[PDB]
Amino acid sequence: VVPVPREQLARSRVLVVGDVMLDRYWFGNVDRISPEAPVPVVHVQRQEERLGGAANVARNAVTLGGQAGLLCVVGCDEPGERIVELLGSSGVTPHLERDPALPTTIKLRVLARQQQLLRVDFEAMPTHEVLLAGLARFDVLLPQHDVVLMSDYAKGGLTHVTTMIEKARAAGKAVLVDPKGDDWARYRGASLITPNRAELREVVGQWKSEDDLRARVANLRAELDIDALLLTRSEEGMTLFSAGGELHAPALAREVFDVSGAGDTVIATVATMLGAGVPLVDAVVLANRAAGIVVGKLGTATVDYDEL
Template sequence: MKPILVIGDCMLDRYWEGAVDRISPEAPVPVLQVQRETQRAGGAANVALNLVALGSEVRLLSLVGEDEAGAQLAGLMAQGAIHFDPVRDPALQTIQKIRSVCRHQQLLRIDFEAPPPARCVRALTERAIALMPQHEWVLLSDYAKGSLGHCAELIAAARRHGCRVLVDPKGLDFDRYRGAWLLKPNAAELRAVMGGWEDDAQLLHKAHELRGQLQLEHLLVTLGEQGMTLCSHLKPCLRLPTQVREVYDVSGAGDTVLATLAHTLSRGIGLEEAVRWANKAAGIVVGKFGTASVSSQELGLDAAPPPSTIDNQGA
């Protein structure tokens, strides 16, 4: 199997965990006595880690600063056996999200980020396009941090090389994702672009309308506690109820869905079946604390029938 190419915004998630026993005398805020600090990979890097946990080989492209956070992120990728191929530059600042946590409850989040220089975004785009002939599946993980500044160009290049592109979008400009094979907005993102809906019929109408406008083969809308909806060209919509048992932390759940889709599709499983696996994976990962992944053993993929016995319609 060819490796899956992941392109997008990477970040380092730091967790400062401890106890709160008093209020600060300087201001009416709790004092967190930090007892443990951990680092996890977020954004596109979390997508890559989820893919590896499921058994895929991954190449990851992103923008990373020549700083301590960038070195930490590179170390996490090495531990995860990910082929990490970042564009590094002294002018880049590695994105960091620091979460102060007491008893698994966030007290505060602190973000460090800055827009990347245009030359770095161009370098990343050219590197990605050069690598596309070596891949069949391309994942664009957009957190609106700047790495995918030439997103439309990446999609056009992928189509020329016969790659199928799956996109996790961000922001209001969905036109930049035109021509992708599959777009995966959540409910809030779809509502911001297409307006609200009162029932399932209106939701499906808006989803089909957006899919047609952007010339997508498939649009998958994740609806949180209401499950998922898949709308495909010339096919009836597939509506899946949620498989969440208990919501503990939704951080990175979209990354898990994107990774599970790509992993199962790359192994010949049909799209509708792949969406069911992704729905199950989302229900597992939201029961974990912080940015996390789901293994093939947890998901039960190891016990799944071979691809030849699964309906491949829609892939």
Template sequence: MLTIPPFDQARVLVVGDVMLDRYWYGDTGRISPEAPVPVVRIGDEERRLGGAANVALNLARVGAVTRLIGVIGDDEPGAAVRGLLAGAGVEPLLLESGSHPTVSKLRVMSRSQQLIRLDFEKSFALDGAFERDALMQRYEQALAGTDVVVCSDYGKGTLADVQALIAAARRRGIPVLVDPKGRDWQRYAGASLITPNLTEFEAVAGAAGDDDDALVERAERLRVDLAVDGLLVTRSEKGMSLFSAAGHLHLPAQAREVFDVTGAGDTVIALLAAGIGAGLEVGDAAAIANLGAGIVVAKLGTATASIAELERAAHAMQGGAVGLVDEDSLVALLADARAHGQRVVMTNGCFDLLHPGHIAYLEAARALGDCLVVAVNDDASVRRLKGPARPLNDLGHRMQVLRGLAAVDWVVPFSEDTPERLICRLEPDVLVKGGDYRPDEVAGGECVRAAGGEVRILDFVEGYSTTAIIERMNASGPAEAD
């Protein structure tokens, strides 16, 4: 049985390329007269830690004692990185460059789709401005209080002397995990574990195709050539494969649905390091990392997995019932989620016939936070609202279908005509409603705002309506038996 351990005794030092991920969100409804490109009216902006900083954030989110060494610029994005790290509980051991900007990536988003990405960067290794001696000195001082080192390489120059970093840690008996970049992996020789994705692995070791025996042979040859203890290869929908002197272990993918793979590799190496730092065998640590990957790919943008999410995923993997809850149980679950820093999103509806419009709406709602609660009208309240012929599917069936969606964490029923009482009890951080409502018209919105939360109105996807589907079905007459 896979158990999520406490990670608060794991002391992890992350060193690598620090980045800032920026997201601009807006609506687009027309094409520019200047060029065949969409015009986006920007409404919201969000900033997230990226690269090695996202690895550190993933570690901090599960409670590991986390420090970060990297390079930022003397600029506003660098200040933003410091602020985000401080808010996450990561100790920054950052060097500041006066001649290089903080590496940042700007993504323009509309209706949960990425339209363009703009990169602002200059390699820290290009002209010698990167102070290698200062970084090495800071690194060696930090090793004294470290259980595990993570080298997060994004090819920006911070890890130009990664071989020296690996050797310094291994001399002290400290395991070193490397997230690699490029094709020159000799620079990672002597590391404890390297965590490439399949594309990165095959670029160095040679393509294996669908031949698992060839994959094992290439991995073992590479492991010996590099004198590393192991390779953990992430294989997308095929899960992960761990290759070590003890043999190989395959871990099937845990994601119910893939929404965005951004930052999944950061989560994998962070949870692997946290597990090893907490005293787990590498196979058990890899299993937890696999669970974490399944969680974050169901989220939009660079994301993290919390202890509560890992525990739910472990419970689900072992056959436990998750997702369907009663009101009292949900109160306790949300208290635990908030204790782990999660942002709770809530929406409601009848969800009688689930269609693509519902899916897009729920995915957009989930992207506003860390967990999504869907409150569902019971059968009696649906009849009062929609008429005696509804619902077509009873409450149990409607809740089971919603439970199966990757975007949905918990499904809870309510019996009133509006969910106002339930919303006021749960006090979500974000209350979401679809359609042409004004925020002050949404049931329960006043309670949410009074508790410091917000009310968001999302557009429905045009062309989909449960009522319209039912009308078309009625117009087509009775269906023939199969």
């Protein structure tokens, strides 16, 4: 893949819509058992914060050189404020609905001696009113972006994904979907869906060969009006199933240290590349190179254009 001039990537406009998250990590020591319960006491010494979910997708898009808008819902709380701050220092243009009744989604990991003891989650469902308000922002934002990205984590932020996909594909805007759950009918009309092996199994069942997989993916795309499917297979790399044929990029990384934000980085890379008007085939290749860097990296991460 030849270089795409930074001036060209800079004109790539990606609208990220989905479930925003704040990844928080508490590192501490465990020297004793609680006096109230047969459980450890963690004396926390340091904290670590990363943008998660759609936010990480969006920030991955800007580090490559592209532009990213973020349409999502947050609460009126400190994690929500932290996300705003982190979005600001990461060049992501925010478009945030605020639900005071909603807790900002935050994934808190607790660690000691370099292992997790627990994960603590705060999350809920945005109100009916708030979601319809975001849908209005979508109509306004849609003409201002070359490509739309749907980052789904089943947190409620994509309840109106179907209508959003229709509006965008009518506008000639390419639509990418990072899926969650098995009910995929909601994703119909998408230009590209990006599941991993586990996610695809719940929809179509276990394949018995590459042919069996190739056939199931083919059925899945016709019955769901989806143009292409990018299957991420970890150790087996990733395989694109488009109408113009297939493409397989073997896993370039040998050592894998942490797999958070892997999927985020992949779909973000393709989107930014597609927004820059580059071929889906090259977009898929670069997405896999990016995925191989992000894996050999602790916590949710990002890649620059040169690293590719």
